[PDB]
Design a protein around this ligand. Sequence first.
Ligand SMILES: CC(C)S(=O)(=O)N[C@H]1Cc2ccc(Cc3ccc(C(F)(F)F)o3)cc2C1
Ligand SMILES: N[C@@H](CCC(=O)O)C(=O)O
Ligand SMILES: N[C@@H](CCC(=O)O)C(=O)O
Lengths: 263, 263
Amino acid sequence: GANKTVVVTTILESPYVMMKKNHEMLEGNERYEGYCVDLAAEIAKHCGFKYKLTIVGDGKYGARDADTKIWNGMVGELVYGKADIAIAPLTITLVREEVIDFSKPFMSLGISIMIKKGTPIESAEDLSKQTEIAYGTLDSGSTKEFFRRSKIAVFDKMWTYMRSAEPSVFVRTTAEGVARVRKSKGKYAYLLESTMNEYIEQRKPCDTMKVGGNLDSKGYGIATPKGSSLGTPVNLAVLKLSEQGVLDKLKNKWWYDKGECGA
Amino acid sequence: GANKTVVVTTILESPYVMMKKNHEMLEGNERYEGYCVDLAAEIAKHCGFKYKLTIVGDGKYGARDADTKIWNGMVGELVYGKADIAIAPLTITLVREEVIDFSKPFMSLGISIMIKKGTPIESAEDLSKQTEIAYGTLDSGSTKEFFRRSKIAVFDKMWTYMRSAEPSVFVRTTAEGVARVRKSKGKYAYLLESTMNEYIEQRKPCDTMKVGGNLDSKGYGIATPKGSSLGTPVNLAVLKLSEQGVLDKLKNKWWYDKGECGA
Ligand SMILES: CC(C)S(=O)(=O)N[C@H]1Cc2ccc(Cc3ccc(C(F)(F)F)o3)cc2C1
Ligand SMILES: N[C@@H](CCC(=O)O)C(=O)O
Ligand SMILES: N[C@@H](CCC(=O)O)C(=O)O
């Protein structure tokens, strides 16, 4: 029928969406800034709709409970129809693609290792063959799933360790994993997406480092409930933005341009 | 209705599809080898269909004629229903996505520069600010389109030169562009996808080099005629193969493992 204001679910995750420092003196979409804020603006213009940014209530990306089969996070919000579109760093996975539609990816990533600077680790293989340095992942996300489902020897080795490690090596938010890297004096490494890894690397206090190659090749896509009218228009808009250079321009804006660790 | 042998259009393009040296003493699919041959086998198994590999009659990727509006190449073959699926290094573009369905990408690429070794060029900017060294692209493809449609200063500068260069700087096949790089004594550089650039770099006579960063970020997707029943199954199979590590394994097989220029 007649066009509705589109409800957008997203996640507070640097540099994609952040509360502006002065958010309290602002209302609506103006409260927020970052790569996915800007991308929301572009997609909305190109598909000709009005929208409201809403941070995902539980603060999670999206995972199905093995028992209940209930989806949580931003995926949950699409699945149960609380939100019309998710515009966030949400990784295209098989388990998600079956319950929600994904645009072609708007940004690439792969799983990667953050160390505190000077940590004697260069790779995942290094992590797997030692125990002095603890390591983990975000909860409720594609990185955790990757390790749990991996048949590859080293990642299976890593997963068997991580699932049973005491204290827990898993974290609620990316900012928590980073905090743990920075405070653990080289005795914690964090497994996170290269995109986030690279952003943080170029942020004060400039004490972290991405090491080794990526463990996989995947992408973020814009997600809509299965069969939503927004799917096709959103997918075309992503490819047009790609082809206009907008995505690279936005990547430059929120990564390189934000760099505060020198050249 | 009842399952038909699926007609697969593909292109002779190293290392994706090649005639085996002994192809003449072979019949059917067995004549061919390479990354997309193997990927065809996997997709077919996972979607449970039988298929016949056919090389695209005109040897082109796919471009619409400005006058007639006729699609040529593998895109043409899908559009006019000569083929049921294209399994090849076929770049996801906006103009193609409107006339055919694309899987999520199975491999990434970006536009890149091949030089003969010792050519005093490190970038696209370098190419644009000189004239002694000629440069071009493949005909009938996404790289040519990228330059023609670019509003970015340097690529617009490059396109204005390339479209009017005498003799023609455009080539019919990748193997022709490479041949021209190798025979032109450093006086030709070739603009081609990084994937192809990287393969050739590691092939005898080991006289070529990828220089500079990629001009864009795009991907290859499996393509089907718009609304084909194969679309969704093929798309899920690509994500499952990604997640099983098959795609990386196949990338290793046909790139690194084929390397004959040392380490
Ligand atoms: C196959 C799935 C795991 S995925 O996450 O969708 N595909 C993975 C592999 C890959 C390859 C290239 C890219 C980069 C990119 C941007 C835009 C496009 C376009 F061509 F589709 F438009 O391609 C991302 C990914 C992630
Ligand atoms: N992008 C991930 C979250 C980050 C991570 O898992 O490392 C997801 O969509 O689940
Ligand atoms: N992959 C390209 C062909 C190679 C090129 O244009 O450089 C296409 O699909 O058109």
